[PDB]
Each structure stands twice: as C-alpha cells, then as structure tokens.
Amino acid sequence: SDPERRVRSTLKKVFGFDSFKTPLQESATMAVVKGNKDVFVCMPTGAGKSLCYQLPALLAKGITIVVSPLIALIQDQVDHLLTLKVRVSSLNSKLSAQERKELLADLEREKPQTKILYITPEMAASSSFQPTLNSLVSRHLLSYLVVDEAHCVSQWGHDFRPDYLRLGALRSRLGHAPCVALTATATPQVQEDVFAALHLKKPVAIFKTPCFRANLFYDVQFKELISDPYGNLKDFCLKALGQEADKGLSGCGIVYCRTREACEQLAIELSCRGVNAKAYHAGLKASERTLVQNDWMEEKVPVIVATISDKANVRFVAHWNIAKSMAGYYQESGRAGRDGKPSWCRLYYSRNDRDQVSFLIRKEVAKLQEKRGNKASDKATIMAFDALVTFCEELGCRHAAIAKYFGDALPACAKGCDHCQNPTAVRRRLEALERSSSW
Numbered sequence: 001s002d003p004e005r006r007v008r009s010t011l012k013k014v015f016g017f018d019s020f021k022t023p024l025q026e027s028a029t030m031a032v033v034k035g036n037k038d039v040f041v042c043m044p045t046g047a048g049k050s051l052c053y054q055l056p057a058l059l060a061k062g063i064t065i066v067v068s069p070l071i072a073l074i075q076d077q078v079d080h081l082l083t084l085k086v087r088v089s090s091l092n093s094k095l096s097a098q099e100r101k102e103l104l105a106d107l108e109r110e111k112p113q114t115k116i117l118y119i120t121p122e123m124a125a126s127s128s129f130q131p132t133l134n135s136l137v138s139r140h141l142l143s144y145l146v147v148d149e150a151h152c153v154s155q156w157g158h159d160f161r162p163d164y165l166r167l168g169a170l171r172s173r174l175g176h177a178p179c180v181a182l183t184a185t186a187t188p189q190v191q192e193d194v195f196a197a198l199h200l201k202k203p204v205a206i207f208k209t210p211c212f213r214a215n216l217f218y219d220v221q222f223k224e225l226i227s228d229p230y231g232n233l234k235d236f237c238l239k240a241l242g243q244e245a246d247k248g249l250s251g252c253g254i255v256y257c258r259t260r261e262a263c264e265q266l267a268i269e270l271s272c273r274g275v276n277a278k279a280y281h282a283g284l285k286a287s288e289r290t291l292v293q294n295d296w297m298e299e300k301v302p303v304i305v306a307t308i309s310d311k312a313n314v315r316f317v318a319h320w321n322i323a324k325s326m327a328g329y330y331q332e333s334g335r336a337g338r339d340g341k342p343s344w345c346r347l348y349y350s351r352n353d354r355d356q357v358s359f360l361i362r363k364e365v366a367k368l369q370e371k372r373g374n375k376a377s378d379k380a381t382i383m384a385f386d387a388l389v390t391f392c393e394e395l396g397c398r399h400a401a402i403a404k405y406f407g408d409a410l411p412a413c414a415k416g417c418d419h420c421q422n423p424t425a426v427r428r429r430l431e432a433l434e435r436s437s438s439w
C-alpha cells in the first residue's frame with residue numbers, strides 16, 4: 001500500500017518485529033526508503049542500525065551493496081539474515097576461487113537474485129571487482145550504497161582503514177543510488193570526516209541519538225580530598241540503592257576499576273563496610289565468573305566490582321578509576337538507569353590515577369609504533385583520554401561536557417549534576433584539590 005504499510009509489513013513478516021526500537025530508528029528507516037537523500041545514521045552499538053538499511057533494501061527493486069570492515073561481524077550479519085531466509089551473499093577474502101566465480105556469475109546475470117551484498121572495503125576497491133561493479137553501475141541495478149562502520153574513514157575514529165577513503169569515488173560514480181552511512185562513533189570530527197570522505201550529497205539527512213539522559217545524576221569526586229575512600233563509596237552505593245526509603249535495598253549497581261587487585265580489595269572493603277559486593281575480573285575461573293554474574297542479574301548480590309563487562313535497574317555506576325576515554329566513560333556510566341528511574345553516575349578522580357592511565361596509554365601507543373611505525377591516528381587515543389580529564393577538572397555542567405564531546409546541543413540539566421546542583425561547592429572542591437599539591 002502506502003510507504004508506512006509496506007514498511008510495517010516487512011518489519012513484521014521478514015524481521016519479526018511489531019515496531020521499531022525507537023522513533024529515531026523508524027524515522028531513519030523511512031528516510032532511506034524514500035530514496036531522495038544521502039543519510040547518516042549515528043546510534044549506539046546495539047540500537048539496531050542494521051535494520052535501517054536492511055529493511056529498505058528489501059523494499060527496493062535493485063541490489064544493496066553494504067561495505068563492512070571485518071568478515072567476522074559480516075558473517076554474523078549474513079548468518080542472521082539467512083535465519084530470516086534473506087537472500088544475502090558476502091564477497092570477501094575467505095571465499096574460494098570458484099566461490100567468487102559463482103557470485104560474480106550471479107551479479108553479471110540479467111536480473112540477479114542477490115538482493116543484499118556484503119563486501120569488505122578492499123574487495124569493493126579491488127581492481128578485480130571494478131568490471132563487475134561498472135556493469136552494475138551502467139546497467140542501473142544499484143538501489144543503495146551502504147557504508148557501515150563509517151567512522152573507519154577517519155584518523156579520529158579509533159579504527160582508521162585506508163580502503164575506506166576509496167569509497168568516496170565509488171559513491172560519486174552513483175548519483176543514481178542514495179548512500180547510507182552508519183556508525184556509533186558520535187564525535188563531530190568523525191561526522192565531518194564521513195561526509196567529506198564518502199562524498200555525501202548535501203543536505204545529509206541526519207538521524208543521531210541524543211546523548212543527554214536527564215535521569216542520570218553525574219558527579220566527580222577527588223580522591224585527594226576524601227578522608228574515608230571506602231566509606232565514601234559504601235555510602236554512595238547505599239544511598240543509590242534506596243537506603244533512606246527504609247523499604248530494603250532496591251536495584252543494583254556497578255563499581256568499575258582498572259586492576260584485578262583493586263577489584264578484589266574494593267569488594268572486600270565494601271562488604272566489610274556494609275554493602276554486599278563481589279569482584280568480577282579475568283583472573284577468575286570462568287566458573288566463579290558466571291556465578292557472580294548470575295548473582296548480580298538475579299539480585300542476590302546488589303553490587304558488582306568489575307574490571308571488564310543489560311540490566312534495567314542499575315541505580316548507580318561508580319568509576320573508582322578514571323576511564324581510558326570519554327567514549328568509554330559515557331558507555332560504561334550509561335549502563336545506569338535504563339529503566340528511566342533516577343540513577344547516579346560518579347567518577348572518583350585523582351591526579352595520580354590520571355597520570356598512571358596517561359602513562360599506560362602512551363606505553364600502548366609506543367608498542368604500536370614499534371610494530372608498524374608512526375601513524376597520524378595515534379594522537380586520537382591521547383585526545384580521547386584528555387577529554388575525560390578535562391571533564392573531571394573543569395567547572396561546569398557534567399551533562400554539557402558530555403554533550404560537547406558528541407556535538408550535541410546544551411542539555412537542560414535541572415540540578416542533574418554536582419555542578420548544576422551547587423556550583424560553589426564544586427568550585428571549592430577544585431580549589432582544595434589545587435591546595436593539596438601546594439606549599
């Protein structure tokens with residue numbers, strides 16, 4: 001019938017869904033279906049970005065080419081589509097010489113039955129694929145060009161791939177077919193690189209998940225100032241778990257830390273000080289690991305202390321150590337409050353921790369340089385950490401600092417962080433921090 005009916009029908013019949021995850025996923029999908037614009041989709045990992053090109057591909061008359069970096073995830077995408085009985089093929093390196101011969105044979109065929117073709121950037125840019133490609137171009141088969149993991153064009157997206165800089169010329173040969181670019185990487189620098197590198201037609205239809213979540217209360221505490229660090233964390237956990245309601249503990253929480261030793265010790269200290277906490281790290285047997293995870297999920301143990309890692313009622317996330325990046329901190333802290341109820345995100349910052357993490361990052365970079373020489377991209381790793389340091393040391397709204405990093409508008413923070421609740425208090429704490437290293 002109408003556009004909405006076709007979409008709703010395929011959504012249910014093919015993919016098995018009664019609705020879209022979000023109005024944003026819906027709007028993005030409809031903009032791809034309409035086919036009048038180039039489209040940029042920027043949503044977190046797991047938001048269902050794939051549907052935004054997979055579904056309109058099936059509604060189109062031609063084939064959809066999808067460029068994706070790693071064959072592993074490609075195969076998982078293909079396997080998933082195969083379970084949906086979707087006619088999906090993948091051209092990459094893992095294919096044998098005859099397997100390519102058969103896939104090429106279909107694409108060179110009049111009215112091929114390949115609907116969606118996954119391909120790596122190297123294969124899409126290989127001199128061997130150009131004949132098959134030029135045929136598709138000139139015979140006007142192509143409905144969509146999809147560039148997944150579009151951040152790979154960027155020296156600032158933490159996974160730069162040279163072959164992704166070849167996709168722009170490829171797209172320009174196709175003024176006929178709309179281009180859809182998708183990624184979870186949400187910085188303005190990366191977005192600008194994507195638009196230019198893929199030669200996207202302007203104005204681009206942008207569908208981007210807003211970062212600001214008003215039910216999360218962010219604050220930064222300076223370990224240098226805390227007289228009783230374990231007691232401080234204990235009280236933070238108990239408050240968040242609904243201590244003052246006197247109806248028993250409610251919800252759960254996570255404490256992130258860098259080392260297994262801190263993990264084990266924090267779990268001990270918290271348990272001794274009045275909140276049941278269990279350690280979770282790679283040094284444990286996978287047995288004990290699975291047990292602790294379940295005890296947390298099943299709310300037998302309210303607090304998990306973790307070195308690594310989606311429950312809906314996470315009332316707090318505390319970072320005992322500053323994270324390696326702003327993106328990392330945002331994703332980790334953002335595990336709190338998925339049910340929409342009030343939650344607390346606290347970062348325990350210390351300049352000693354800052355120095356140690358900065359040191360470790362630069363040691364990692366140096367290892368990479370010994371391996372494959374200097375790269376333009378190595379500054380990105382440092383800057384991503386520096387943005388989180390600024391977040392900790394700066395006076396201003398915590399939600400705003402996060403928004404700035406992702407290029408979002410000014411958050412309507414209604415006393416939703418420590419700075420906005422009491423700016424003078426935060427300024428006083430920052431002044432005490434400077435005095436701690438004074439004469």
Ligand SMILES: Nc1ncnc2c1ncn2[C@@H]1O[C@H](COP(=O)(O)OP(=O)(O)O)[C@@H](O)[C@H]1O
Pocket residue numbers: 017019020021043044045046047048049050051
């Ligand atoms: N409308 C929807 N309703 C429910 N689940 C969905 C919907 N769209 C996608 N999903 C599911 O969400 C999961 C994440 O999809 P994926 O495309 O891998 O996310 P992303 O690419 O954004 O990381 C997939 O398992 C997919 O089946």
Ligand SMILES: [Mg+2]
Pocket residue numbers: 049050
């Ligand atoms: Mg994806």
Ligand SMILES: [Zn+2]
Pocket residue numbers: 396397398399400413414415416417418419420421
């Ligand atoms: Zn604020």
